[PDB]
Amino acid sequence: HVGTFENITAAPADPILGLADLFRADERPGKVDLGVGVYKDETGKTPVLTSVKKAEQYLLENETTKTYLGLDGLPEFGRCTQELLFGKGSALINDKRARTAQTPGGSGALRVAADFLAKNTSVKRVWVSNPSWPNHKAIFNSAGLEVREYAYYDAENHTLDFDALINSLNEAQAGDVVLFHGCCHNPTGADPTLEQWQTLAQLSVEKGWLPLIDIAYQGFGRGLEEDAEGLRAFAAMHKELIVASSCSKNFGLYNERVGACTLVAADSETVDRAFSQMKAAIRANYSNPPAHGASVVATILSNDALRAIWEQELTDMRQRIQRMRQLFVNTLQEKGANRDFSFIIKQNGMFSFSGLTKEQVLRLREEFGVYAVASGRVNVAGMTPDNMAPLCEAIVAVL
Amino acid sequence: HVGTFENITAAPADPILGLADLFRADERPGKVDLGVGVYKDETGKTPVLTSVKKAEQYLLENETTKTYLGLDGLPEFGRCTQELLFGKGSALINDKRARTAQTPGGSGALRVAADFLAKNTSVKRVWVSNPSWPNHKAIFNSAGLEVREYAYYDAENHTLDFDALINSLNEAQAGDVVLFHGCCHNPTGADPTLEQWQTLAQLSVEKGWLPLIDIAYQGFGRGLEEDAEGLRAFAAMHKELIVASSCSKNFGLYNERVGACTLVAADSETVDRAFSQMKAAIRANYSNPPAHGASVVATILSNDALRAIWEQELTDMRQRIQRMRQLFVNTLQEKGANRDFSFIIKQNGMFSFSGLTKEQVLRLREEFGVYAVASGRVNVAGMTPDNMAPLCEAIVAVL
Structure with a gap:
């Protein structure tokens, strides 16, 4: 009798999980994970x-x-x-x-x-x-x-x-x-x-x-x-x-x-x-x-x-989320983003589409240690006053 | 447009729930619930x-x-x-x-x-x-x-x-x-x-x-x-x-x-x-x-x-369960049950089929405030040293 499970095709691997593993193993001190799916406070915790x-x-x-x-x-x-x-x-x-x-x-x-x-x-x-x-x-x-x-x-x-x-x-x-x-x-x-x-x-x-x-x-x-x-x-x-x-x-x-x-x-x-x-x-x-x-x-x-x-x-x-939304837009401008990102202040909650392409997302990870998901979705609760500047510099560099 | 829910038929009544309702409205002090689906300790609680x-x-x-x-x-x-x-x-x-x-x-x-x-x-x-x-x-x-x-x-x-x-x-x-x-x-x-x-x-x-x-x-x-x-x-x-x-x-x-x-x-x-x-x-x-x-x-x-x-x-x-099984059988015997219940002592866990008919189960509820489910399944964890005699007396009375 052949196994009932013997011929089961594996489910495709979850890309976000593979991303999370990559982030965990990333030894660059400048890394930032904007791909997370939960709230985080100003210290990066979900208490x-x-x-x-x-x-x-x-x-x-x-x-x-x-x-x-x-x-x-x-x-x-x-x-x-x-x-x-x-x-x-x-x-x-x-x-x-x-x-x-x-x-x-x-x-x-x-x-x-x-x-x-x-x-x-x-x-x-x-x-x-x-x-x-x-x-x-x-x-x-x-x-x-x-x-x-x-x-x-x-x-x-x-x-x-x-x-x-x-x-x-x-x-x-x-x-x-x-x-x-x-x-x-x-x-x-x-x-x-x-x-x-x-x-x-x-x-x-x-x-x-x-x-x-x-x-x-x-x-x-x-x-x-x-x-x-x-x-x-x-x-x-x-x-x-x-x-x-x-x-x-x-x-x-x-x-x-x-x-x-x-x-x-x-x-x-x-x-x-x-x-x-x-x-x-x-x-x-x-x-x-x-x-x-x-x-x-x-x-x-x-x-x-x-x-x-x-x-x-x-x-x-x-209010922390609203603050990061405003600080994100202002810092992009300060860093000379060649585009308008005001739509960010008009959106509700922790998630927005950044409008970055998958190639820019990939570049952001490899070159700058900034992690987002393939769709360009970013979680603004992954942002803090302390990581905002380099994160935005990186984004500007990729536009 | 007509509603999506309008033609939904009510699910069949849940007899267990209905029996639990009955039990709660029963104001008699000698009640004994053998129909419960969980462990109960000697004081009748599930701690x-x-x-x-x-x-x-x-x-x-x-x-x-x-x-x-x-x-x-x-x-x-x-x-x-x-x-x-x-x-x-x-x-x-x-x-x-x-x-x-x-x-x-x-x-x-x-x-x-x-x-x-x-x-x-x-x-x-x-x-x-x-x-x-x-x-x-x-x-x-x-x-x-x-x-x-x-x-x-x-x-x-x-x-x-x-x-x-x-x-x-x-x-x-x-x-x-x-x-x-x-x-x-x-x-x-x-x-x-x-x-x-x-x-x-x-x-x-x-x-x-x-x-x-x-x-x-x-x-x-x-x-x-x-x-x-x-x-x-x-x-x-x-x-x-x-x-x-x-x-x-x-x-x-x-x-x-x-x-x-x-x-x-x-x-x-x-x-x-x-x-x-x-x-x-x-x-x-x-x-x-x-x-x-x-x-x-x-x-x-x-x-x-x-x-x-x-x-x-x-x-x-x-061990409390095993003891109640033993006490149940011994007490039925000395209350003069017209039948052998020795099978109870051998069985494992809190449930057994008592072997009582649905007529006897009804009568146990109506006349004695002793509650089991229609199938005659009993939970021996619903028995205690203090309730065992009155319980067995009721059962004997309906045999």
């Missing part, structure tokens, strides 16, 4: 938030059991998530039109959403932005859903090409899913204005798309409430919505896998039937979600003083 | 282990980041898992034939296995015991794999009907997966002897089955090393294996979702190829596993003092 440490001590001191949570996780975490997303006092919440399952990260929410749709609806196609967040295609394809891309970013001119966006969406059919990033578009940082969100929401009602909002950076854009405006514009207009949310970045809980899939339907009965089937999708997967991270979030948000410490931490991160 | 609390204190003091780990999770947790399963000095480990991905529970492991097999192999069917763990079917079916049942338990006579077992497996084709519970068969508590494990392993090699060992109770049967005998008998004989393991029960870490999927192939290069595609299955699912629980486990297993504490805790749980 545990003090609010999180305090919450963890509280749990250490007060938790008396690890017995299984239900399929939908910690109820208080679901309530806190819904309040963050829709606002406390939302008619949506009051009308009991929303149900939330705590999931292993926003990624887990996306997969749960995909399995639920594939098994319980006629959805056959999910639309994502160009450029896309690479993991979306893998997740949706895995449930048998086709993924198509709509027009979004004008890379030559560094804008969200809104007219191209809405025209390209004419190809989306009633009952297709259309996925939008809630704020801090990953990887461009280019977000719809509120007026644009309202136009998209109206169009979605007219065409009959089911909107899916991926929101993993609430609070990194302009603020907690402002970053939810687009989601809330959709929520005001639609009978139905799916939200895949994450606390990986805004609570710095990446590896604890804390997020949620929220369903919204026309009425309480409908969301309840749908939610019963989403629970079935969970039962066939990882069964119930990991408690530690969600418990931390609930513990922070439920307590006035702790919540205050966390919101200041979040504000700190957002 | 956090002392070794776990100590480990969590240490992580609170020491952790400086929660940034993402790789798709396979924490390397040290993977190694500690492999040691537990295969033993120190395993030729298989020495030959670099195994790879382990940390997963959200044994459930996550089983789903990761299913997706990996469906996408990368010609496996069409997974064989499971009659009866088996309730969630197996949904998990494997979700990945597109047919689930078939093999003969296992003789309910009238309370035995593992081994001849029926091996004859029923003649129907399993080369390349099919055959799933065995590693120890403490859930829900019968009836396990193969070592000799029967060896016979099964030989048949498997001759027939060309791919064995999958589902092990969630290592340490609850006879002891850590003893409970691995069956898995190791398969390991000795096979070029290929899959193990889905769980720390939910032996570490009391249920809600932290800590388990693993381990692949074994003929050699290192082959398992590398296979494991790379397993990682791809993870990436399309929840992306990376939850750190807290696995970190706790690695912390405990890597420290001699802590490990000794945990082992004593595990021994205490195993």
